[PDB]
Each structure stands twice: as structure tokens, then as C-alpha cells.
Design a protein around this ligand. Structure first.
Ligand SMILES: CCCCCCCC/C=C\CCCCCCCC(=O)OC[C@H](COP(=O)(O)OCC[N+](C)(C)C)OC(=O)CCCCCCC/C=C\CCCCCCCC
Ligand SMILES: CCCCCCCC/C=C\CCCCCCCC(=O)OC[C@H](COP(=O)(O)OCC[N+](C)(C)C)OC(=O)CCCCCCC/C=C\CCCCCCCC
Ligand SMILES: CCCCCCCC/C=C\CCCCCCCC(=O)OC[C@H](COP(=O)(O)OCC[N+](C)(C)C)OC(=O)CCCCCCC/C=C\CCCCCCCC
Ligand SMILES: CCCCCCCC/C=C\CCCCCCCC(=O)OC[C@H](COP(=O)(O)OCC[N+](C)(C)C)OC(=O)CCCCCCC/C=C\CCCCCCCC
Ligand SMILES: CCCCCCCC/C=C\CCCCCCCC(=O)OC[C@H](COP(=O)(O)OCC[N+](C)(C)C)OC(=O)CCCCCCC/C=C\CCCCCCCC
Ligand SMILES: CCCCCCCC/C=C\CCCCCCCC(=O)OC[C@H](COP(=O)(O)OCC[N+](C)(C)C)OC(=O)CCCCCCC/C=C\CCCCCCCC
Ligand SMILES: CCCCCCCC/C=C\CCCCCCCC(=O)OC[C@H](COP(=O)(O)OCC[N+](C)(C)C)OC(=O)CCCCCCC/C=C\CCCCCCCC
Ligand SMILES: CCCCCCCC/C=C\CCCCCCCC(=O)OC[C@H](COP(=O)(O)OCC[N+](C)(C)C)OC(=O)CCCCCCC/C=C\CCCCCCCC
Ligand SMILES: N[C@@H](CCC(=O)O)C(=O)O
Ligand SMILES: N[C@@H](CCC(=O)O)C(=O)O
Lengths: 408, 135, 175, 49, 98, 49
């Protein structure tokens, strides 16, 4: 019945727009506002919902030593109970006598949902790997040589130049008017015909698999090589917990991650957990907003269905009710939470608030497939080889005619 | 053969000049199917790109700047810009050298420059369409 | 018993050019531009070079080589066998791309299962499932706890807009 | 008499190769559907393991 | 190991990352952490040993020694070869092996 | 590592070496949980699981 020093957020506490009609406790609502009710069962004490106008979660500030926002309301005697998202740091423990954690989060990654990649020019030879398309060309020449050697030193229109046209005549299945005539020239023409039947029916078959079941990749998964393979913008939140864990980095794989944020520009940090979603949401190229875990699985769920959590829990930090260093209400507070946790009423509120909104994920990705026609950009490399093949052909037309003109 | 050359210069000449290469109808939807009105609808060209619905103002700009998806396409149209220009180069070379031939190899070498313009324009239309389906 | 009433799946008329759906219309106009563009180049590359190829027998080669049949002449020069070389590779990738997506339009819309039960309609959040208001059916989902119905009442109570209609004649029309 | 032997063998080789290209595009797009377990709730349904 | 892809084993993540870094590398950590807990140095209830060791782990933290020990027995143990590192493509074209 | 059973059979395992008075300080990979909170004492969590 004193001060709720919470902050306007995602589903823990926010002002819902029904306060434009309603009043009372229903001015500010959410997960932890329900937690205010079942902590009032044991302590007896009511609420006073005061969203921090200074709310910049923070700690004691750098070299001014003024406590910021929530602890700017909590520590100075302006508040005593702190039912809210509040992360227990050991330097915060130096300032605040806490309670035992609700849940625990980790430092997470909000990458944007994998939208389909742009196929390159040479994406037409995706369904057969770059070892086979080099094994074919050397088996093309490797068979076209053996037609030559067999049909020459034996009893002849098979030169070299007419034997590179039979083998190319058979690989594009366009057939032949040459048609070798020995027994030892028909075995080369035979087993090469069985070669082209399997490879073309493996190209068509695999391309019918890429265009039906399209598994996708999130290339910045598993945050150790997010740090190592530096490709994308290491975005994150600002003043609060998530920078101060990485400021005190002693695990070197997180330190070299922090140095890249230390050498970042222009978004070393920005602000606003809502906006940090939006900076992923609209840039979509490289921004990789590094927020706390329990906020990340909410935004991912809500209903844009456009972000996704790669990696998991780069730290383990806890949400506990903060009390300003001695704060006599503490023993009613923490024993309540224990009786909320051990009975599972806090877990019951976990079951409630993270299944409220429209459910998403692979849940929405059921039988919803409509698959599109190929655009030109999937086979556009073949039109470049085709026209570029003609530019080679009209070039040799001059070279052949000049070698008949300079023959004279 | 003169007339197909005469008609060839003007038709691509109108096309490379005008501002009606590509349309756009970026809108919204509502339930009861309640689609949209116009919300954002730009027609576009190769050198002057003129918005029509989002602001109604014809900012037919020599593309270097603004006046989000729009200029992004115009950076990709920039990647496909020179190929109708090369096809217009080799056409007029094939045009004049054909008339000189009427007034020998002079007619035949012009027929090379018609086909080199045509094969330039196929890669012209492909890379223009490959830029759009990219965006 | 409480039952579900959806719209029947009448299929369509497909529209009678639906066979050239697996390639978009930019491909079917760039084949024809590259079918003329190859057939003209085959004419020139075997004319001032050392006869049997006019422009007209060159169109019959390129159309013969594109539908993968065996049009009868052949190109005969290293200048000429390249035009017949890359056009044979062009018609291998396009037809294999056509056969792929037509085997991808079909086996995707063969996966598509109509709703056949209540618990199937529980997961499929696409369809909005609104029942009668002020009747026995609204009472059934609100009270009972079969826990497939607990989730169904949950999404039905969070209506957007009101899925409870008010009456049966309006409810049939809303489907 | 002769164009029938070349007639029905041409129909034989149309159905066999179209049956080969079908199942090789059915071995692949079935084992491309096959998703490894990636979460706890996925392993909830997959009673095989 | 003996079930050949038929048996899952729910164990803690700190043990799991080491087990998949032993020379028969044929195990992998599947998903994210199903919860979060913590290891603790234990004393009996109301022990004199409590607060010296409690003040130790606080001191051991910011000195950087305990997370050096987190490295010390785990950092070099990629002696298996770490074959997961050269496999993130998961390519899907046919290879020569097909 | 530790447990709790039918009556108590007191806390079967390594915590049974710590609840019975078998030993003092228990540097170990023992997990901190709420059941072990009330019976014996702990340090601060030095790792993350
Ligand atoms: C004198 C008569 C006998 C010689 C034959 C000449 C006529 C050849 C006719 C047909 C053969 C196929 C067409 C040859 C030229 C077309 C282009 C080509 O087929 O070229 C393929 C490769 C070029 O691929 P790359 O190595 O540059 O890319 C490697 C990228 N990576 C590292 C990711 C794997 O080159 C090669 O092997 C081509 C080998 C050249 C032979
Ligand atoms: C478990 C076991 C598995 C195996 C299953 C059985 C598979 C049976 C396959 C057999 C194929 C082997 C060859 C069969 C026929 C031999 C013909 C031969 O050896 O090459 C033909 C030669 C010469 O050819 P050419 O004149 O066209 O060269 C001129 C070309 N230039 C101009 C370049 C010089 O002689 C000729 O013409 C001969 C033409 C008339 C044939 C004479 C009688 C042959 C009788 C039976 C043959 C066996 C059939 C079995 C079924
Ligand atoms: C682009 C060039 C494509 C092909 C150009 C023509 C062949 C070039 C060649 O290379 O022809 C060298 C000679 C061919 O001899 P020929 O008797 O067929 O003359 C021709 C007999 N007519 C006139 C009746 C046909 O020598 C030979 O035999 C070559 C024998 C085999 C050499 C290996 C082929 C692959 C080499 C790859 C490395 C580059
Ligand atoms: C029959 C056998 C001959 C051809 C075999 C099938 C053609 C595909 C082989 C090939 O590999 O081609 C594809 C190459 C590039 O693919 P890549 O994997 O090698 O490099 C990777 C390039 N990255 C890294 C940028 C992605 O793109 C190209 O050059 C396209 C050139 C291939 C055109 C085939 C026919 C042209 C022959 C002309 C003369 C022949 C008649 C007279 C002798
Ligand atoms: C005008 C004159 C003729 C012109 C044309 C000449 C014909 C050649 C033309 C094209 C080639 C097609 C036929 C060649 C194919 C090779 C047959 C073959 O390699 O079959 C495979 C079996 C091995 O399979 P596997 O059970 O071990 O697989 C399981 C093993 N794992 C478990 C390790 C994966 O090989 C074996 O057993 C070997 C036992 C079979 C002995 C050969 C019979 C098959 C070939 C017949 C030729 C057809 C034409 C007749 C004239
Ligand atoms: C015997 C067969 C006949 C010819 C042999 C094959 C000819 C291959 C020519 C390749 C040109 C091309 O594929 O062009 C596409 C270029 C980039 O291709 P890249 O090979 O230079 O770089 C590597 C490609 N990577 C890094 C994007 C994956 O990107 C572009 O759109 C640039 C614009 C397209 C290039 C000009 C059009 C072709 C020539 C016309 C005269
Ligand atoms: C050696 C001498 C030559 C020998 C070969 C001669 C070529 C013939 C050989 C094979 C046939 C291939 C070409 C014929 C295919 C018909 C094209 C066609 O019917 O196109 C489709 C459109 C109508 O469908 P839609 O757009 O309304 O779709 C929407 C439909 N719904 C209502 C369901 C929504 O038709 C239209 O618009 C009409 C506008 C297009 C005008 C004709 C261009 C197409 C044909 C080009 C021939 C290529 C060879 C050139 C020489
Ligand atoms: C000179 C070249 C001769 C042919 C010229 C090109 C043929 C017609 C292309 C065309 O401009 O028509 C495109 C129309 C536009 O449709 P839309 O944007 O209103 O629909 C979507 C409307 N939205 C977006 C509101 C949902 O309709 C279409 O898409 C369908 C057009 C398909 C035409 C089929 C022609 C293929 C003929 C032969 C194949 C190759 C044989 C030769 C080798
Ligand atoms: N719970 C965090 C929020 C801000 C942040 O994640 O940095 C804090 O109080 O510091
Ligand atoms: N005949 C039904 C109509 C309402 C309903 O379907 O639930 C009744 O009286 O309860």
C-alpha cells in the first residue's frame, strides 16, 4: 500500500488504453500487476502504481553516482517495494537487498525472421553441387576423347570437332545425326546415354525438392560465431543491465564481442525496448538487437511474426523484487514469492501471460503453403549465358571469316 | 530494311525518354476484404521517376537522392540503366552505316550493329526484370 | 451434437491458360525474345561463313531444339555449333524448371488438408470460429474443461471483432 | 509390322523414365521434409525418440 | 551412443557442452536451455564455513579467476576436432556420393 | 548428487554427506534448487545452467 515503482513495458506492466475509460488499479496492468495481487495475499499490503517518469532502468550513474530511474525511485526512500522487471546485478546487490528470483533470463539475440534469400545469377545450378558440375565437364571431354580414339585407330566422320558435338548432342538430349557405327563406338555412345539419363533426372528431381520444402537458414545463430564471424551490426539496448554485464567481461569470447560493441558505430546502444525491436524490424540487413531473453520471446510471439530468437541465454540473471537496503517489508515480500513459486502460482502466471495473445511461430506455419511461380531472377543466369554465348559465337564468326580472308 | 531501321530508332527513343516503364500499387487491406484506395502508387521510368499517389507531386528526379522501396529500386534500375543505352548506341551506328551503304560490306556491317543492339536489349530487359524481382 | 459449419470447398475454374502458371510471364516473354535472338544469330553465324541455313530453317532449328525434338539439319562450324550449343543448355534448364514447379504446385496443394475435426481447428488460427451468442452452445465452451475446448473458448473470448453473431440466420450468412 | 515395335517401345520408355524422375523427386522432397528435433516441445509430440 | 538416434538424454548444459567435445563426437546440444539454475558451493545449514566461502566467490568473480577456471578445463577440450564448425552450411544439393 | 524420497531417508546422495553432518564445505557441481535452499546453505551461483 506504498509505492509500485514499475515501468511501462511489454507484458509485465503497461498502461492499457482502457484507462482512457477506466480507473483504479486498472490504470496500469500486466503480468506483474497480477503478481501484485498474489503477493498481497501474504503481506496484506496494497498497490500504488507509479510508472517511473525517469525510467531508464540503470544503476548509480557513471561518476555522478546518482541512481537512475527505477532505482532512482527505489533506493532514495521514494519507493520500498519494486514489483517490476528488475535484474539482480551484484553491484545492484551492493545497493539493494533483494528477494529470490521470479524466473531467470539470459542475454538473447533478436535477429529478424529469415525472409527468403535473393537468388544469385548462378542459382540455377543450386540443385546439383559444384563438384558435380565440374565432374560432368571433365567427363564430357573424357568421353568425347574416347569416341575419337576408338573411331580413328579402327575403321570416318568422327574427328575431334564432330565428337565434341555428339557428346554435347547427348547431354542436352537433343540427339544426333552422326550416330557411331562400330561396336566399340556404340559402347561409348551407350554408357554416355545412360549418364545423361540419370543426371538430368537428378537435376529435375532435386529442383523439385528445393521448390517444395524450403528449409531456411538463420546465419547468425549460436552467438559465439556471431562474435567471431563479424558480419552484422551488434545492436543492443542502453543504460541498464545488458551493457554492464558486457562492460565487466572477463570471458574472452564475450570480451572480443564487447570490443566490437566498443568499436561499434553509430548504434553502440540506442534506447527503448520497443524501439530496439523496430531497429531490427525496419533495417532488416544487419541489426541484431541484443536484449534480455524473457522480453524477446514475447515480441517474437505477439503478432507481427517477424523476429526470431537465435542462440540462447548468454548469461543467467534473475528478476527479483528490489528493496532499498534493509527495508522492513522484505521478509513479508520474499516468503510470499517463495510460497508463490513453490506452490507454482508464479508459474501459474507464467502459464497465463505468455499464452494470452495470438500464438505464432511454427504454430502459424502449419498447412499454409501456396508456393509461388518462378520469377525471372531464378533462371536469369541462363539468359546471361545464352546471350553471352552468342557474343562468343558472333566473335568466332569474324575470326573464322578473317582466317579465310587473310588466307587470301 | 530502311523502314525497320527508321521505326527502330523512334520506338526505343520514346521508351528511353518516357517515364512509364514500371508501375506500383503499394496499398493495405482490411477485414470484410475492404482492400484499399490508392495508398501508394508511383509510375516510373529510367531517368525521371514520378510519384502519383503518395504525395500526388511529380518529383521527376534525376536519380541521386530522395524525391523507402522506391529509390532502392532506382539503385537497381541504376544497375540496369546502360544496357538500353548501349542498344541505342549500336542502333544509330547501325542506322547511319546502313544509309551510307545505300549511297559492299557497308550494309552487312550495319546488320551486325542491329543484332548487337538486340542482344544488348535482351540483357537490358532481363537485368531490369531481375532488378525488380530482387526488390 | 455441436458441429462445425464452414464454406464448402468448391475448387475453381482454373482459367484456361493455367498450364503456364509454373513460370511467370516475364519468363515466357524472355524465352520468345531469346528464341528470336538465337535463331537470328544462327542465321548470321552460318551465312557469311561456309548455305543450308536460311532464316527460315534457322527458326525451325531453334524451335526444334527448344521442344527437345530432333530437327534435322545440324549446325556445322565451330562458329555455328556454339549457337546450337548454348541454346541446348538453355532449353535444358528451362524445361527442368517447368517440370519442377509444376511438380511443386501440385504436391504443395496436395498437402493442403481441409479442417476435419475440432482439435484441428484449434491450431488453425487462420479461420475465425464464432458460435451463437445467448444459446446453449456458448454455455458449453465456456464451462467445460476437455482442454481442447478450453483453448477454443480462449481464442473465442478474445474476439476481434465480436465472433458471437447474435442469431442463426446471421451466422449462416457470416460464413 | 516394324513401326509397332518402335511404337510400343517408345511408350514403354516414356512411362519408365517418367516414373524414375517422379520417385527421385519423391525420395528427395520426402527426406527434405524430415526435420531433426530442435526444441523441447517438438520432442513432446515426437514419441518415436 | 548405443541407441543410434533413438534415445534423448536430458542433462545440464554445463555437462552437455563438454560431452559433445569428446573424441567420439556424435552428440549435440539440441535446443536452448529449458530453464536456468546455478551451481553453488554448499555448506551445512548454519555453518561457520558459509560466509568466508560466500565472500570468496564474490571475490573470485571480479578477480576473473572462476571464469578463468570456466575456460581452464573447457577451452582446450576441443581436441575432438570440433567438426560442427565446418558443417554450418548443411548443403542440400546432390553430391558425388549420390 | 542429491534427492528426497518416501519419508525423508535423509536426502539420499552427496547432500546426505552434507545434511547428516558427514562433512562440512562441499565444493562440488551441486545444483542450487529450492528444496536444497531450506535444508542446507549455499554460495552465490558461480556458473550458469
Ligand atoms: C581444343 C579442343 C578440346 C578442348 C575443348 C574446347 C571446347 C569446350 C566445349 C565444351 C566444354 C564445356 C564448355 C567449355 C567453356 C564453358 C565454361 C566452362 O565450362 O568452364 C567451367 C570451368 C570454369 O569454372 P571456374 O573454375 O572458373 O569456377 C570455379 C568456382 N568454384 C571454385 C566455386 C568451384 O572451366 C573449365 O573447367 C573448362 C575446361 C576447358 C576445356
Ligand atoms: C547374362 C548375360 C548378359 C548378356 C545378355 C545378352 C545381350 C546380347 C547383346 C549382344 C551385342 C553384341 C554384338 C551383337 C552383334 C555383333 C555385331 C558386331 O560385332 O558388329 C557389327 C559388325 C560390323 O559392323 P559394321 O559393318 O556396321 O561396321 C561398319 C562401320 N564402319 C564403316 C565405321 C567401318 O558386323 C556386322 O555387321 C554383323 C551384323 C549381322 C549380325 C550377324 C549374326 C549375329 C547373330 C547373333 C548376334 C548376337 C545377338 C544376341 C542377342
Ligand atoms: C573451340 C575449339 C573447339 C574444337 C576445335 C576443332 C578441334 C581442335 C583440336 O584440338 O583438334 C586438334 C587435332 C584434331 O585432329 P583431327 O584428325 O580430328 O582433324 C580434324 C579432322 N576433320 C577435319 C575431318 C574433322 O588433333 C587431335 O587429334 C586432338 C586429339 C585429342 C586431344 C585432347 C582433346 C581435349 C584437350 C583438352 C586440352 C585443351
Ligand atoms: C555437355 C557438357 C558441357 C557442359 C556441361 C553442362 C554445363 C554446366 C557446366 C558449368 O559448370 O557451367 C556453369 C558455369 C559456372 O559454373 P561453375 O560451377 O563451373 O563455377 C561456379 C561459378 N560461381 C562460383 C560464380 C558460382 O557457367 C558457365 O560458364 C556456362 C557455360 C556452359 C555452357 C555449356 C555449352 C557451351 C559450349 C559451347 C561450345 C561447345 C560446342 C563446340 C565444342
Ligand atoms: C549395340 C551394342 C550395344 C550398345 C549399348 C551397350 C550397352 C551399354 C549402354 C548403356 C549402359 C547401361 C547398362 C550398364 C549398367 C551397368 C549395370 C550395373 O552396374 O548393375 C549394377 C550391379 C551392382 O548393383 P548392386 O546389386 O551391387 O547394388 C548394391 C550395392 N551397394 C549396396 C553397395 C550399394 O552390377 C552388377 O551386379 C553386375 C552384374 C550384371 C552384369 C551386366 C548386366 C547389366 C548390363 C546390361 C547391358 C544392357 C545392354 C545389353 C546388350
Ligand atoms: C562457351 C559458352 C559461352 C560463354 C561462357 C560463359 C559466359 C559467362 C559470363 C558471365 C557473365 C555474368 O554472369 O554476368 C553476371 C555479373 C557477375 O558475373 P561475374 O562472372 O562477373 O562474377 C561472378 C558472379 N557472382 C560473384 C555474382 C556469383 O553480374 C552482372 O549482372 C553484370 C552485368 C552482366 C554482364 C554483362 C552481360 C554479359 C556480356 C554481354 C556482352
Ligand atoms: C519456322 C516458322 C515458325 C514455326 C513456329 C511458329 C510458332 C508456333 C509454335 C509453337 C507455339 C508456341 C507459341 C503459341 C503459344 C500461344 C501464346 C498465347 O496464347 O499467349 C497467351 C495470351 C493469352 O493469355 P493471357 O495473357 O491473357 O493470360 C491470362 C489468361 N486468363 C484469362 C486465364 C487469366 O495470348 C495473348 O495475349 C495474345 C498476344 C500474343 C500474340 C502472339 C505471340 C505469342 C506467340 C509467339 C510465337 C513464337 C514464334 C515466333 C515466330
Ligand atoms: C513479342 C513477343 C511475343 C509475346 C509477348 C509476351 C506475351 C504476353 C505477355 C504479357 O504482356 O501479358 C502479361 C499479362 C499480365 O497479367 P497481369 O499482370 O494482369 O496478372 C497479375 C495482375 N495482378 C498483379 C493485379 C494480380 O498476362 C500474363 O501474365 C500472362 C502472359 C503469358 C503469355 C504466354 C506466351 C507464351 C507462348 C509461347 C511459349 C514459348 C514458345 C516459343 C519458344
Ligand atoms: N532489467 C534491466 C533492464 C535494462 C537492461 O536490460 O539493460 C535493468 O534493470 O537494468
Ligand atoms: N436450439 C438451441 C439453439 C442454441 C444453440 O444452438 O446453442 C437451444 O435452444 O439451445
Amino acid at each position: 500500500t506504498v509505492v509500485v515503482t514499475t515501468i511501462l513495458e511489454s507484458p509485465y506492466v503497461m498502461m492499457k488504453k482502457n484507462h482512457e475509460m477506466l480507473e483504479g488499479n486498472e490504470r496500469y496492468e500486466g503480468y506483474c500487476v497480477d503478481l501484485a495481487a498474489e503477493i498481497a495475499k501474504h503481506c496484506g499490503f496494497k498497490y500504488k502504481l507509479t510508472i517511473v517518469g525517469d525510467g531508464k532502468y540503470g544503476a548509480r550513474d557513471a561518476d555522478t553516482k546518482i541512481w537512475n530511474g527505477m532505482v532512482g525511485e527505489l533506493v532514495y526512500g521514494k519507493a520500498d517495494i519494486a514489483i517490476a522487471p528488475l535484474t539482480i546485478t551484484l553491484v545492484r546487490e551492493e545497493v539493494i537487498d533483494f528477494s529470490k528470483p521470479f524466473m531467470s533470463l539470459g542475454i538473447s539475440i533478436m535477429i529478424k525472421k529469415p525472409q527468403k534469400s535473393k537468388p544469385g545469377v548462378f542459382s540455377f545450378l543450386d540443385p546439383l553441387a559444384y563438384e558435380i558440375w565440374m565432374c560432368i565437364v571433365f567427363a564430357y571431354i573424357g568421353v568425347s576423347v574416347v569416341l575419337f580414339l576408338v573411331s580413328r585407330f579402327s575403321p570416318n566422320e568422327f574427328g575431334i570437332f564432330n565428337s565434341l558435338w555428339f557428346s554435347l548432342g547427348a547431354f542436352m538430349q537433343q540427339g544426333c545425326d552422326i550416330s557411331p557405327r562400330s561396336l566399340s563406338g556404340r559402347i561409348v555412345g551407350g554408357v554416355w546415354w545412360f549418364f545423361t539419363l540419370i543426371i538430368i533426372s537428378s537435376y529435375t528431381a532435386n529442383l523439385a525438392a528445393f521448390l517444395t520444402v524450403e528449409r531456411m537458414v538463420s546465419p547468425i545463430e549460436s552467438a559465439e560465431d556471431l562474435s567471431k564471424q563479424t558480419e552484422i551490426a551488434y545492436g543492443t539496448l542502453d543504460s541498464g543491465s545488458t551493457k554492464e554485464f558486457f562492460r565487466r567481461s572477463k570471458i574472452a569470447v564475450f570480451d572480443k564481442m564487447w570490443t566490437y560493441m566498443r568499436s561499434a558505430e553509430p548504434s553502440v546502444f540506442v534506447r527503448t525496448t520497443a524501439e530496439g525491436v523496430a531497429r531490427v524490424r525496419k533495417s532488416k540487413g544487419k541489426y541484431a538487437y541484443l536484449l534480455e531473453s524473457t522480453m524477446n520471446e514475447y515480441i517474437e510471439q505477439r503478432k507481427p511474426c517477424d523476429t526470431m530468437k537465435v542462440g540462447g541465454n548468454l548469461d543467467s540473471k534473475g528478476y527479483g523484487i528490489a528493496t532499498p537496503k534493509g527495508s522492513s517489508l522484505g521478509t513479508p515480500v520474499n516468503l510470499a514469492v517463495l510460497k508463490l513459486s513453490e506452490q507454482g502460482v508464479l508459474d501459474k502466471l507464467k502459464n497465463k501471460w505468455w499464452y494470452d495473445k495470438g500464438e505464432c511461430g511454427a504454430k502459424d506455419s502449419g498447412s499454409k503453403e501456396k508456393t509461388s511461380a518462378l520469377s525471372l531472377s531464378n533462371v536469369a543466369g541462363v539468359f546471361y549465358i545464352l546471350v553471352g554465348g552468342l557474343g562468343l559465337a558472333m566473335l568466332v564468326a569474324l575470326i573464322e571469316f578473317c582466317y579465310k580472308s587473310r588466307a587470301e | 530494311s530502311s523502314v525497320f531501321a527508321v521505326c527502330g530508332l523512334g520506338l526505343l527513343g520514346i521508351a528511353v525518354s518516357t517515364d512509364y516503364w514500371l508501375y506500383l500499387e503499394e496499398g493495405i487491406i482490411l477485414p470484410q476484404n475492404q482492400s484499399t484506395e490508392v495508398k501508394m502508387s508511383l509510375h516510373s521510368g529510367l531517368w525521371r521517376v514520378c510519384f502519383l499517389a503518395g504525395e500526388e507531386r511529380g518529383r521527376c528526379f534525376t536519380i541521386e537522392y530522395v524525391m523507402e522501396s522506391t529509390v532502392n529500386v532506382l539503385k537497381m534500375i541504376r544497375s540496369a540503366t546502360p544496357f538500353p543505352l548501349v542498344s541505342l548506341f549500336f542502333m544509330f551506328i547501325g542506322f547511319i552505316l546502313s544509309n551510307i551503304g545505300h549511297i559492299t560490306i557497308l550494309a552487312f556491317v550495319s546488320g551486325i550493329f542491329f543484332i548487337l543492339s538486340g542482344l544488348s536489349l535482351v540483357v537490358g530487359l532481363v537485368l531490369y526484370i531481375s532488378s525488380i524481382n530482387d526488390e
